[PDB]
Amino acid sequence: PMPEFVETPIPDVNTLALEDIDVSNPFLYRQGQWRAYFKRLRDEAPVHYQKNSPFGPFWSVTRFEDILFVDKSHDLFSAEPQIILGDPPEGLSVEMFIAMDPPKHDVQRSSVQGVVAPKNLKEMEGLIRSRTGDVLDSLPTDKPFNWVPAVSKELTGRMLATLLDFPYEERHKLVEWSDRMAGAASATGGEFADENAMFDDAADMARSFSRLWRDKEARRAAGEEPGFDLISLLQSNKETKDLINRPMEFIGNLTLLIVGGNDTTRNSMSGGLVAMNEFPREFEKLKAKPELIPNMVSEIIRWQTPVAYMRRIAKQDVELGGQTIKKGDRVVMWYASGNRDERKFDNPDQFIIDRKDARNHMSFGYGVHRCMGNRLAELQLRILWEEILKRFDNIEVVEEPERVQSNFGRGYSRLMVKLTPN
Numbered sequence: 001p002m003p004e005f006v007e008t009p010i011p012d013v014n015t016l017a018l019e020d021i022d023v024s025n026p027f028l029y030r031q032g033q034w035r036a037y038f039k040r041l042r043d044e045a046p047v048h049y050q051k052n053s054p055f056g057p058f059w060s061v062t063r064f065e066d067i068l069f070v071d072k073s074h075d076l077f078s079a080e081p082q083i084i085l086g087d088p089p090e091g092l093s094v095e096m097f098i099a100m101d102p103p104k105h106d107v108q109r110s111s112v113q114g115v116v117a118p119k120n121l122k123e124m125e126g127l128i129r130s131r132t133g134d135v136l137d138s139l140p141t142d143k144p145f146n147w148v149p150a151v152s153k154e155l156t157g158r159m160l161a162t163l164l165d166f167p168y169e170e171r172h173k174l175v176e177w178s179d180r181m182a183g184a185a186s187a188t189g190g191e192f193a194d195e196n197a198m199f200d201d202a203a204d205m206a207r208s209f210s211r212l213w214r215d216k217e218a219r220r221a222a223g224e225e226p227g228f229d230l231i232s233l234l235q236s237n238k239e240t241k242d243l244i245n246r247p248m249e250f251i252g253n254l255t256l257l258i259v260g261g262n263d264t265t266r267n268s269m270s271g272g273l274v275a276m277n278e279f280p281r282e283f284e285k286l287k288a289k290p291e292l293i294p295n296m297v298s299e300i301i302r303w304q305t306p307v308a309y310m311r312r313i314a315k316q317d318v319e320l321g322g323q324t325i326k327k328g329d330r331v332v333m334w335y336a337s338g339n340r341d342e343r344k345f346d347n348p349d350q351f352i353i354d355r356k357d358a359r360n361h362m363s364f365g366y367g368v369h370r371c372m373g374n375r376l377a378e379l380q381l382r383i384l385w386e387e388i389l390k391r392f393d394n395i396e397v398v399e400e401p402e403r404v405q406s407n408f409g410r411g412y413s414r415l416m417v418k419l420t421p422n
């Protein structure tokens with residue numbers, strides 16, 4: 001079985017030989033060493049091969065331009081069979097089109113992408129803004145509180161329930177299933193190492209999603225107006241009316257949607273407060289010019305970079321960065337490094353809400369796999385900060401945030417926040 005990752009002090013990157021830099025360490029982000037580790041890789045070995053890691057050997061691509069090329073070159077780099085650095089526990093690999101190459105990727109993505117179509121997102125705006133306001137007003141203003149479960153996880157869990165028309169009181173299952181899936185120690189160095197519970201969740205997921213398919217189909221056959229959820233959309237198109245006869249296209253598509261939006265949205269909502277705390281002149285600039293929120297949302301997403309990387313496999317030998325990536329080698333596109341590449345962003349470690357090229361960030365990736373839910377993610381963040389400006393004159397992080405163990409997700413498990421209303 002995959003042993004748990006136990007945290008040990010990560011030394012300064014300059015004490016290491018270039019060949020010994022291992023950025024798969026799932027504690028790099030928590031210990032605040034990722035910036036120095038990736039900067040040295042960008043400057044001295046932008047295409048870096050690590051032959052010794054707990055996940056096996058892999059290439060690290062750390063420069064913005066080189067990540068662009070790898071992400072856009074689905075002719076040279078495959079997203080199959082997995083896009084995380086390591087491997088899922090054997091038997092637990094789920095086929096998701098995020099880890100599929102064209103043309104099969106295009107067919108499956110096209111059958112689900114309507115759930116985040118612009119018209120369908122506008123139909124969700126009122127509920128998103130209603131829930132955001134209902135969560136923010138319920139927050140205490142006389143004492144600090146943990147922002148992660150109070151706001152980030154709360155709003156995220158509701159959004160995921162809306163996307164699937166999942167039972168509202170069972171929405172916590174979607175978060176729990178997604179957390180254990182994305183936090184598998186064998187895949188991302190996360191803290192979930194019990195493979196038995198992963199098989200249990202996969203069984204509960206199949207049963208619960210199947211029962212949801214039946215219930216929606218029965219409700220549809222009874223004349224219930226079709227909603228804006230993925231299930232309603234899938235049962236309204238001829239090509240996916242029988243998707244239940246394809247359990248893997250069914251479970252994989254539904255599993256990808258909830259894992260895709262779970263801790264990404266959660267950590268984007270928390271990360272904006274961390275950036276505001278580290279650069280408070282941007283909060284004054286925001287209150288003076290609230291029209292900057294759309295661009296600030298992009299800058300929040302760039303600065304946080306909730307998904308640290310996507311992994312590829314070289315379909316062939318590929319020359320890149322002066323190195324020869326061999327066919328079959330694993331290649332890791334470090335978005336978290338690309339978004340801090342000063343070759344692309346001036347003062348890249350600085351949170352600048354009116355940054356002219358904030359929209360050019362690679363937190364959503366690029367190419368055929370570029371985040372399908374990116375507009376929904378930006379919509380939730382825009383509404384959250386619109387509703388924050390309506391209510392609060394200042395937001396203070398009163399404690400050192402606690403960061404999640406993972407090399408894949410960059411997020412916070414604890415964010416103590418003190419609110420000051422206006």
Ligand code: HEM
Pocket residue numbers: 071097098099105109163256257260261262264265268301305306307309310335363364365366367368369370371372373374376377378
């Ligand atoms: C700020 C929040 C988010 C970030 C940073 C993010 C990040 C990413 C990244 C890096 C990829 C892979 C890009 C690539 O390989 O080139 C991706 C793909 C994807 N994301 Fe997100 N995501 C976010 C929110 C969401 C949400 C809210 C949803 C759905 C509700 C979602 C659904 C998906 C799906 C379905 C894919 C697969 C698309 C494909 O492979 O064609 N994401 N996302």
Ligand SMILES: CCCCCCCCCCCC(=O)O
Pocket residue numbers: 084087088089092093094180181182184187198199259260
């Ligand atoms: C965003 C990608 C989802 C994370 C995939 C990691 C491993 C695939 C899931 C296999 C089942 C499991 O880990 O419990």
